[PDB]
């Protein structure tokens, strides 16, 4: 369980948070 979340976070960390958030915002609007 908890391990799956940590592993997941390790994957997301590969991306640029500032860019990710910009793109999510465009996707929404």
């Amino acid at each position, epitope marked *: 369980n908890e391990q799956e979340l940590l592993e997941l*976070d*390790k994957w997301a*960390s590969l991306w*640029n*948070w500032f860019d990710i*958030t*910009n793109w*999510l*915002w465009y996707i929404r609007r």
Partner: antibody
Amino acid sequence: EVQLVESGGGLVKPGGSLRLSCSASGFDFDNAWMTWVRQPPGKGLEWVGRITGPGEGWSVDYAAPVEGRFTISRLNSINFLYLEMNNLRMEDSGLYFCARTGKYYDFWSGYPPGEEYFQDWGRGTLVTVSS
Amino acid sequence: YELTQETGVSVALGRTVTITCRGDSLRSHYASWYQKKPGQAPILLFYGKNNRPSGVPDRFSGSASGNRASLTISGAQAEDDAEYYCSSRDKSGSRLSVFGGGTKLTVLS
């Protein structure tokens, strides 16, 4: 499990330099965003700066009054965060905390770049700038 | 002073109190909330839309509307007597963060 321990605070003259350290344990330090916060005497918490992760190429942002004088860095192999301070001023005097920093973004209502928040804190190390 | 909080608020033991954080950035960004007692590291209480970390009592909850964020304590305990800080972006869409000036909460117990 999460432990944060700052050191390197002391007395230093105006114009001087100082390097603070924070050793971290009990969490994935390599991927964690890390923030420095300070509390001047008699006053509140003040955000100093934050270093990001591998995804962001370890970029750093700094509070305006501190920009150009402070440098935040990290050594992931030994789980350390560092604050190098140059050209120190009396107003820099105070209690420095390092903080494990989380990131939040609400897909439906959020606005980039979402928010950062401070999940774990050290006990802090005391900086005194005075002649 | 991008984020403003009450200087001091008092509440009777076991009653309900709300403290606020105000600033332009809060229109766009959620706030996080921290308890701080003298000579102790701050503690995270609440963040984002509706997130209370494990370990925080359920009597703590945050909300938001317009340029205001609020922290509510439903049934104040003696140990809630402390300083509270909010944090958020300094400006809408900024990569920087900032704290409000802090509120001293007196629980008369």
